[PDB]
Design a binder for this molecule. Structure first.
Ligand SMILES: OC[C@H]1O[C@H](O[C@H]2[C@@H](O)[C@H](O)[C@@H](CO)O[C@@H]2O)[C@@H](O)[C@@H](O)[C@@H]1O
Ligand SMILES: OC[C@H]1OCC[C@@H](O[C@H]2O[C@H](CO)[C@@H](O)[C@H](O)[C@@H]2O)[C@@H]1O
Length: 350
């Protein structure tokens, strides 16, 4: 029955990426090495090349305290779960790409096991995998609930699993309705595979309100850590988004993050940079979410190192190939402990 102000919050979801590899464990320094994206407005014949994922040159503007780690290393996973405990983030929202490979399956099991040791829960963030559609989504939801639903770390809210659906707008509401209306042709409602389905609110209310209603989503999130990147990721809209959610029986889970920078992998994307300012950016965004009066908050991200949105500890590093950004006047674990601060403020408000 403790009341220490240190406990995990199970309405706080932190987006987690399990796609990092090491040569030793995975055969390649996966994701630390990454293709550089061509400029979509830069014309033909670009040869942007690749970041090689050497110790000196990784696919991030920051540098992990844990180095070029493997997401399959149980010892890294232990450390990450201890970081979630420090942050008070009770739910790990795991990227899920439907890779259909044994190394994926192994990783997911390792993450569930490590999470449970620290009473962390896991939900899935369903990514835009090839030919994703409501039929294979249903099949995959069935598979995930069947495989993992009895694992003690599998997240439930009032008895239901929860999924975040990235880029949900890539599927028409008429298709979503088949899966998510109680009357839908292939409904999950009232079945063993029912779940809270949280779609991505992107653009203006004139588009998103009917999308969400007609698709029969249970709620919506915003993902992007960069303020103003979309209507949904503009925090001054969050009070009105929450009002609409409450009026329509939907769960709004705004996404907050500490900054954004992706110019190692997208050199042309500098206008999306959002400076961390020693934590002031994160504070401002988190405060807006709490002030909007929401029931749940998502954090972009634990470890999306390519996009510079991570709260995972980063260290100063200057190599012969790149001078990395770092947490400046703040210590490496600052964003974990600042997350814990905001989780406490959120709980005080709840
Ligand atoms: O700024 C780049 C942006 O790229 C990716 O987002 C793309 C797509 O998935 C989003 O739905 C739309 C929203 O308007 O933007 C892009 O086309 C993500 O990797 C994102 O975090 C990143 O900022
Ligand atoms: O988890 C939702 C999205 O989060 C942002 C990253 C995005 O993946 C794309 O971008 C990354 C680079 O940041 C690439 O490594 C991926 O292959 C993908 O293009 C997630 O979908």
């Amino acid at each position: 029955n403790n009341n220490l102000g240190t406990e995990l919050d199970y309405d706080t979801f932190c987006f987690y990426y399990d796609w990092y590899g090491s040569e030793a464990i995975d055969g390649q320094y996966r994701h630390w090495a990454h293709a550089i994206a061509p400029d979509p407005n830069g014309g033909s014949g670009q040869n942007p090349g690749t970041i090689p994922g050497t110790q000196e040159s990784i696919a991030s503007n920051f540098y992990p305290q844990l180095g070029r780690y493997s997401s399959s290393d149980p010892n890294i996973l232990t450390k990450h779960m201890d970081m979630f405990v420090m942050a008070r983030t009770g739910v790990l929202a795991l990227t899920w790409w439907n890779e259909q490979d044994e190394t994926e399956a192994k990783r997911i099991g390792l993450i569930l096991d490590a999470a449970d040791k620290k009473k962390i829960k896991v939900c899935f963030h369903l990514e835009p995998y090839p030919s994703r559609n409501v039929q294979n989504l249903r099949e995959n939801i069935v598979k995930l609930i069947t495989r993992y639903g009895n694992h003690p770390a599998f997240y439930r809210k009032d008895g239901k699993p929860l999924f975040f659906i990235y880029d949900s707008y890539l599927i028409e509401p008429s298709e979503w309705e088949k899966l998510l209306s109680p009357g839908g042709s292939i409904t999950i409602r009232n079945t063993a595979y029912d779940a809270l389905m949280i779609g991505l609110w992107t653009s203006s209310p004139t588009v998103q309100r009917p999308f969400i209603l007609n698709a029969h989503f249970d709620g919506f999130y915003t993902y992007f850590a960069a303020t103003g990147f979309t209507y949904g990721s503009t925090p001054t809209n969050w009070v009105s988004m929450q009002k609409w959610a409450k009026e329509n029986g939907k769960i709004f889970i705004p996404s907050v993050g500490p900054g954004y920078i992706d110019t190692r992998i997208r050199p042309w994307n500098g206008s999306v940079i959002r400076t961390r300012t020693d934590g002031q950016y994160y504070d401002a965004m988190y405060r807006k979410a709490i002030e909007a009066g929401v029931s749940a908050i998502s954090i972009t991200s634990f470890n999306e190192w390519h996009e510079g949105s991570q709260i995972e500890p980063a260290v100063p590093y200057t190599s012969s190939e790149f001078t990395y950004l770092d947490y400046e006047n703040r210590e490496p674990d600052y964003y974990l402990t600042r997350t814990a601060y905001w989780v406490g403020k959120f709980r005080e408000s709840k």
